[PDB]
Design a protein around this nucleic acid. Structure first.
Ligand SMILES: [Mn+2]
Ligand SMILES: [Mn+2]
Ligand SMILES: [Mn+2]
Ligand code: NA
Ligand code: NA
Length: 320
DNA sequence: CGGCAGTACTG
DNA sequence: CAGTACC
DNA sequence: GCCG
């Protein structure tokens, strides 16, 4: 915000490290970029840079070069491959390893990929919907998608609870996809739904492509009827009722919020996953060596916060 | 030095 | 298994 | 990359 002239430079590096496979450096840049954006003032010195959590020696140095000097030496030394690697890894189902392999084999455009690359089933779908999957939808369309899933699920069993999570539940104006979470208060009737539910959503022509079909998670592609509609990513997760609060929290995110909550859980000798909050977990030197611990009862998202000794945060307040 | 998350599909 | 993906 |  006050330092976008710094963060604009740093995000180019962050992206370059990401698509090249250096996930840890990329994580460090992403965190520092979020810290600099959230800051209350323009950073104007080295020791002020060091003041911020997430900015250490090397990041402060780069912020210092940006100031006064106006640019960053390293940006001029980013491999010419990065834009192509970004292009390739924006195919759903292709990550850094696949993108680098394609690059090594001589492929430089999606036309090369289309005409010469061997593609997995998922990657052919990702390529078929390449532009669509880079578009975010208006949240009103996320609502229509959630209600389509809900109506199809509640026709099989009216007791099923269905909730769109992710960025939708965090109140965002646009959504990259729809994350639909399904449970049943009876603790049992959630099981074996996908056979009927997915077949039902196919009958409409609503489901257009399947990317992942598991016993508890479906990842695929839908499209609402009528003209002017794009293909949209749809994820559906079925969970036992006892896990509903932790799944609500995890799949609402954001990813950084979840990461921050896992770190806090660790400081308290606990662990937090999409399935449960666990206590008296045993670490040896930050590594969970032994001590899986015990699952704590968490009927509500509020209980997770309370058991972590934290004040409750509405989903809109988790958009980190 | 070494964690920075666990969970699940695919092939 | 490695790779990719979910937040 | 950061940080304990
Ligand atoms: Mn989402
Ligand atoms: Mn999703
Ligand atoms: Mn389309
Ligand atoms: Na710092
Ligand atoms: Na991808």
């Amino acid at each position: 915000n006050h330092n976008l002239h710094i963060t604009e430079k740093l995000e180019v590096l962050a992206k370059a490290y990401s698509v090249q496979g250096d996930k840890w450096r990329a994580l460090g840049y992403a965190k520092a970029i979020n810290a600099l954006k959230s800051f209350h003032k323009p950073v104007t010195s080295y020791q002020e840079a060091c003041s911020i959590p997430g900015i250490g020696k090397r990041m402060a140095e780069k912020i210092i070069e940006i100031l006064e000097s106006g640019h960053l030496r390293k940006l001029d030394h980013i491999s010419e491959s990065v834009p192509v690697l970004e292009l390739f890894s924006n195919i759903w189902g292709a990550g850094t390893k696949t993108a680098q392999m394609w690059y090594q084999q001589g492929f430089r455009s999606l036309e090369d990929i289309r005409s010469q690359a061997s593609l997995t089933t998922q990657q052919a779908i990702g390529l078929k919907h390449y532009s669509d999957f880079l578009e975010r939808m208006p949240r009103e369309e996320a609502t229509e998608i959630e209600q389509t899933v809900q109506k199809a699920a509640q026709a099989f069993n009216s007791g099923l609870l269905c909730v769109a999570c992710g960025s939708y539940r965090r109140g965002k104006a646009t959504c990259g996809d729809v994350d639909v979470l399904i449970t049943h208060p009876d603790g049992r009737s959630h099981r074996g739904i996908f056979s009927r539910l997915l077949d039902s959503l196919r009958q409409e022509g609503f489901l257009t492509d399947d990317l992942v079909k598991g016993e508890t998670k479906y990842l695929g592609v839908c499209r609402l009827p009528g003209p002017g509609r794009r293909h949209r990513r749809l994820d559906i997760i079925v969970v036992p009722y006892s896990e509903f609060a932790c799944a609500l929290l995890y799949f609402t995110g954001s990813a950084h919020f979840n990461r921050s909550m896992r770190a806090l859980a660790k400081t308290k000798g606990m662990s937090l996953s999409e399935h449960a909050l666990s206590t008296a977990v045993v670490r040896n030197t930050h590594g969970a060596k032994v001590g899986p611990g015990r699952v704590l009862p968490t009927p509500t998202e509020k209980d997770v916060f309370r058991l972590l000794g934290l004040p409750y945060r509405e989903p809109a307040e988790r958009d980190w």
